[PDB]
């Protein structure tokens, strides 16, 4: 009766190095609703990360969008770190501009 979160990390607009943008971490399909989500820049936690209001899908599983304004580059690494009761340890998903 618990469901582990699906995770997608991506940008609002197509990535342009030096072009300002939004980094998204979309967590969905999870239950219960208690969840911790952090956006990371080069391994470090980003403060000023906002999220959508808790809602759920037809199958009752919850979904949330965590996002922050960012400017991409060739070297800067980005990722999402998610913790949930169904996870023995935090799950990290790296941002891939082609996905």
């Amino acid at each position: 009766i618990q469901r582990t979160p699906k995770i997608q990390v991506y940008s609002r607009h197509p990535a342009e190095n030096g072009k300002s943008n939004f980094l998204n971490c979309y967590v969905s399909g999870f239950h219960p609703s208690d969840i911790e989500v952090d956006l990371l820049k080069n391994g470090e936690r980003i403060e000023k990360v906002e999220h959508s209001d808790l809602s759920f899908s037809k199958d009752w599983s919850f979904y949330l969008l965590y996002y922050t304004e960012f400017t991409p580059t060739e070297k800067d690494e980005y990722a999402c770190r998610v913790n949930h009761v169904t996870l023995s340890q935090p799950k990290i998903v790296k941002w891939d501009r082609d996905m």
């Binding site: 699906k6 609002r12 197509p14 939004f22 979309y26 969905s28 209001d53 759920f56 082609d98 996905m99």
Partner: protein, 274 residues
């Protein structure tokens, strides 16, 4: 032509850390327009879309009061449910509700909804006839008998056929500039060499509304349902959505592949290629 309004209620208990937290969000189609959080300093229903901001003080007062009442009622429900299932007071539990109306092109109710889930599982639901209930288990059958005695079905049918539809159509008119203007996807195809044998073709759909969309890859005209990677439709963060579909092709055969996109914002279905 097939518009909906939905409210989603979520209450979660936190034993030893005070009363359960109650959250409510409301949607017209795929657009959230209100929210409420019982933990807020002075909890109010708050606007989440531009077209709702115009509603006057009485609108906000009334819905805020309903939300505050629901907060308390949900706490009563959680306690009752705990008893039905002989559960202890040490565990956190969840009560969810979704309800609302679908309106047809004639402006009449097409379908009403009112259903509940306890700890992520179907608990009780109002049937499509809006006059009978479907109870998932013996606990939910207790609830049903209380709600039959209180004639809840009759009260909900009234709301769903009248108030619900009337407000939905009002919202649709007030926000018609955004709500009744489908935004077709911006589309393109990318190509990512895996090695010399093969490469990935990814078909993109960006910034579309509403969320409903169909993306498929074809080789020579036949669908690749089996070899296609299809990600879940995701929010862009600006009230539009994104989706992509990818397929692995042998180097030199990219030619045989076409991406097909269907969306209500498109004059005609698109077919893209690399």
């Amino acid at each position: 032509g097939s518009h909906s309004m939905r409210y989603f209620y979520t209450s979660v208990s936190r034993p030893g850390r005070g009363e359960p937290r109650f959250i409510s969000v409301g949607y017209v189609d795929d657009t959230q327009f209100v929210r409420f959080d019982s933990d807020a300093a002075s909890p109010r229903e708050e606007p989440r879309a531009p077209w709702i901001e115009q509603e006057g003080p009485e609108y906000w007062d009334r819905n805020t009061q309903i939300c505050k009442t629901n907060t308390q009622t949900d706490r009563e429900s959680l306690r009752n449910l705990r008893g039905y299932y002989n559960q202890s007071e040490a565990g956190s539990h969840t009560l969810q509700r979704m309800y609302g109306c679908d309106v047809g092109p004639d402006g009449r109710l097409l379908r009403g909804h009112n259903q509940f889930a306890y700890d992520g599982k179907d608990y009780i639901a109002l049937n499509e006839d809006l006059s009978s209930w479907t109870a998932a288990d013996t606990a939910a059958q207790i609830t049903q008998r209380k709600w039959e005695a209180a004639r809840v079905a009759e009260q909900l049918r009234t709301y769903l056929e009248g108030t619900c539809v009337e407000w939905l159509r009002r919202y649709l008119e007030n926000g018609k500039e955004t709500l009744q203007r489908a935004d077709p996807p911006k589309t393109h195809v990318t190509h990512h060499p895996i090695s010399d044998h093969e490469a990935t073709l990814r078909c993109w759909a960006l910034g579309f509304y509403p969320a409903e969309i169909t993306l498929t890859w074809q080789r020579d005209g036949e669908d690749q349902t089996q070899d296609t990677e299809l990600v879940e439709t995701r929010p862009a963060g600006d009230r539009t959505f994104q989706k992509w579909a990818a397929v692995v092709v042998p180097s030199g055969e990219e030619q045989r592949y076409t991406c097909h996109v269907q969306h209500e914002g498109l004059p005609k279905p698109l077919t893209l290629r690399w």
